[PDB]
């Protein structure tokens, strides 16, 4: 029926997100974001210390590639060919996965810079009730979490936050105009992350 006020909900999600250590994430890009090859990714992230494992589909020379990836001890590895691990050097020289959960420049920072918050509706995300919430994320906050986005103005955005319970950020979308966008879904907050 009636929707909660978006502002307090965002502020709560911000606090909860700052305390996050680990999560499963699914990330997709709709349309085209110039300079970003990635199309989809699914994986598990933990921090302090940083480690990540998952799969990614990206374009590497006009071909679509499915690779498994691991970030461990600061290094990125991926299977560019089946069951064959390649070492691509320091993950940070491509993208440090812990960025997403960095309390100062990751999802928590997006939330803290999410302006004009307005509750729009309710949606199920991964079997949970969430409030869909519209607003605008600052260019700087966007560029810090997602450099290839190259924001030059506030970015229209939608976040879905758990209506009840821990009020976690379930999903976020950044709209780059047209049907070009990036979206990420978070689940399994606090899961123990494998061992590469």
Curated annotation (Swiss-Prot):
It comes from the Bacteria. Induction: Part of the lprG-Rv1410c operon. It is a lipid-anchor. GO terms for molecular function: glycolipid binding; phosphatidylinositol binding. GO terms for cellular component: bacterial extracellular vesicle; cell surface; cytosol; peptidoglycan-based cell wall; plasma membrane. Disruption phenotype: A single deletion mutant leads to loss of expression of efflux pump Rv1410c due to polar effects; in infected BALB/c mice 1.5 and 2.5 log decrease in bacterial load 15 and 35 days after infection. The single mutant increases sensitivity to malachite green, sodium dodecyl sulfate (SDS), isoniazid, ethambutal and ethidium bromide, alters the permeability of the cell wall; both genes of the operon are required to fully restore the phenotypes. It is found in: Cell inner membrane; Secreted, Cell wall; Secreted; Cell surface. Residues 46-65, 106-125, 183-196 are annotated as: Prevents bacterial uptake by a human macrophage-like cell line. Forms a U-shaped beta-half-barrel with a small hydrophobic cavity (1500 Angstroms (3)) which holds a triacylated PIM in 1 crystal structure; the 3 acyl chains are within the cavity while the sugar moieties bind to the protein surface. In the structure bound to triacylglycerides (TAG) 2 of the 3 acyl chains are buried in the cavity, the third is solvent exposed. A flexible lid region may move to accommodate different TAG molecules. Helps membrane protein Rv1410c (P55) transport triacylglycerides (TAG) across the inner cell membrane into the periplasm; TAG probably regulates lipid metabolism and growth regulation and plays a structural role in the outer membrane. Binds TAG in its hydrophobic cavity and transfers it between lipid bilayers, probably to the outer membrane in vivo. Binds di- and triacylated phosphatidyl-myo-inositol mannosides (PIMs), and glycolipid lipoglycan modulins lipoarabinomannan (LAM) and lipomannan (LM), facilitating their recognition by TLR2. Bacterial LAM blocks host cell phagosome-lysosome fusion and is one way in which M.tuberculosis evades the host immune system. Triacylglycerides accumulate in lipid droplets in the cytoplasm of M.tuberculosis stationary phase and dormant bacteria, and are used as an energy source during starvation. Belongs to the LppX/LprAFG lipoprotein family. This is Lipoarabinomannan carrier protein LprG. It comes from Mycobacterium tuberculosis (strain ATCC 25618 / H37Rv). The chain holds residues 36 to 231 of 236 of the full protein.
